[model samples]
Target: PEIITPIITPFTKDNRIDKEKLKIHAENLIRKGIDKLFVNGTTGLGPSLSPEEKLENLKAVYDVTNKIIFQVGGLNLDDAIRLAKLSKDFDIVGIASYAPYFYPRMSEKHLVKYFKTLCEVSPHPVYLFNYPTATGKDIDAKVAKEIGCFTGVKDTIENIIHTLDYKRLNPNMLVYSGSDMLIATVASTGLDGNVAFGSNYLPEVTVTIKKLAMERKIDEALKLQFLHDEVIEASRIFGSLSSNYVLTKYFQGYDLGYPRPPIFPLDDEEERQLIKKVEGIRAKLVELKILKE
Candidate 1:
């Protein structure tokens, strides 16, 4: 029941929030069957928007889905608390945070205190987000445990870049792998589950991986993993250098509308090639019975 998947924020042409598109996106993912939807996290471009914008977007998602648990990220303490308080009006289950910007390279002590302060004021449960690539600081297991012990902090979003050892993880700390590429392996570690970007493109594959991991079917998990690696490779072939948000919009545009600019639509050649590649992979997955037609 702890598996989660990120809900990407959609934007209008003038760079404002696209409530209708977001509603459709939320409904689509809810039907795909994730346990929860993590809105305004890194994949949702949390750092790019203001606290007020995050609140509006979170509300849009809440309006679209009734049963999915929502976790909103507020990296800045004041903004995090503001969003957390607003979330109390809805069904938001918890708040999560990455380290604050401009204060990178924080020591473990600083992290512990930072999270403690956020936890103290958050109206909902708090989850520590340890994304070193984005935050530039690693929350080692010791620091993770220390923060996990805080009054409201009960979960962690582990970055795959850190290579955390799950066996050493605190029992009370529910772990959700924040890495799309390592979801299966992370789930296999007996951690809670994943909040992945890849699930946006391949939700069925992720569902199978989760089922195998939960059933303790190691062989089937690894087999499905090999297929996932193939799709990951195709992502690289398409455009590994592009941001995931951009790639997501491209995939959606193949069936949806053009993505808002600043995050521009992919070039014609790149767009055509990506669609071909994605369709090919879909066909392959269907052939293997990993995805339905």
Candidate 2:
């Protein structure tokens, strides 16, 4: 039951992909018991990177673990196909893609056509990354069930009902929660694992929550679920998704570098306060025996 981490892309000062630091970061997460990784996905700044850069990112993480989900979705169909073809060169366990965001009216027919083409070229199972929040289009569960090529889905929407729709339609379908806050909630629904940003720093906590929830230990699961919220409350002082890089660096002591352009890192003063809150929660978790000393 290893939690999947959509590992962040570390960038150099000139905004280049820091492949070396990325390897180190991947190693750190694996040490914390996160074996599966989602490379070049939304959290990893996939769309912002070129096909070459995405391949390099895949190689960097593949050096640490072969359990990788290579996200090949973007605005360009040709580029997505190229990446999907190249993914065959690696030990990627699965391939995933988000719906085209450039057009909000991307109908179910178009989605089926796009994923069918991907399935034909992809060497591995293809999982539809349904993130309407970021992709501006939702993969209707009914449409997803009809496409029949998808091995599973990574549903990142806020509502569990959307995820439940997929489960309701097909119980055997592998359903993963993409929301960091919904891991325990989704686990309670008997879905599969998660691909969340919180796992970058809280892998053990997130995994424990999923395990407890699946074991029918709701009370213990909620304890760790609330832990996720506490950490988010501290991390989001800057803004949503902005704290991923800084929080990972601050907690794990790995200089995973700053997020790419347009997403600013927290200033020193803000980071200081963020650390104080996280440290307080860390100590509290220890007292509660939820985390190791």
Clashes of 2: 0
The digit string of per-residue lDDT tens for model 2 on 175-211 reads: 8888778878877777787888888877778878888
Q: Write candidate 1's Cα lDDT for 1-293 as tens digits.
A: 24576666776657787888778777766777767777776656667777888888778888977543334444557766666667667766677777665566666677688777767767766766666666666666667666764322222343443434532556455666765556667777655677776766566777787788778897787777777766666667644423344445543342323344444546777766766666766677778787666
Q: Mark the regions of model 1 whose C-alpha exceeds 4 Å error after superposition.
A: 66-76, 148-169, 236-264
Maximum-TM-score candidate: 2
Candidate 2 accuracy as lDDT: 0.83
Error of 2 at 105 (Å): 1.8
Tell me the lDDT of model 2 at 51. Answer: 86
Give me the displacement of residue 246 in model 2, in angstroms.
1.7
